[PDB]
Design a protein around this ligand. Structure first.
Ligand SMILES: [Pt+4]
Ligand SMILES: [Pt+4]
Ligand SMILES: [Pt+4]
Length: 129
């Protein structure tokens, strides 16, 4: 599913992401926009053989099992395919574990490079929440 900006903001808010670990909603919407362009079905292969999955491009090296990343850790305890669903629940629950891991949203390279220190509130501007 390709989400609209406000539709996704609303889903993320409902799933407990607004101010999760201090990160306002706008940060999460910005990350999703540049990681996956709001497409739950996004996959991208990394040079090390791992793959990133779904709306928040969660990586198979640490977080999920895809059966093809030797020495992966499956920390969210989930097949990576579950992260591609139109229901964002699995992605959100896993993202909560990731952002709690010590490096906050810096775990998402597009967030660091494209959202961090920008006016992220603009991403939720005009939405009914
Ligand atoms: Pt709502
Ligand atoms: Pt939902
Ligand atoms: Pt594996």
């Amino acid at each position: 599913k390709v989400f609209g900006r406000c539709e996704l903001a609303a889903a993320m808010k409902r799933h407990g992401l607004d101010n999760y670990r201090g990160y306002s909603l706008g940060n999460w919407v910005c990350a999703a926009k540049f990681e996956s362009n709001f497409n739950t079905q996004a996959t991208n292969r990394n040079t090390d053989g791992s793959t990133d999955y779904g709306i928040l491009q969660i990586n198979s090296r640490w977080w999920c099992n895809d059966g093809r990343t030797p020495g992966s850790r499956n920390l969210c305890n989930i097949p990576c395919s579950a992260l591609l669903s139109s229901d964002i629940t699995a992605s959100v629950n896993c993202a909560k574990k990731i952002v709690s891991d010590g490096n906050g949203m810096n775990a998402w390279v597009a967030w660091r490079n494209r959202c961090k220190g920008t006016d992220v509130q603009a991403w939720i501007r005009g939405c009914r929440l």
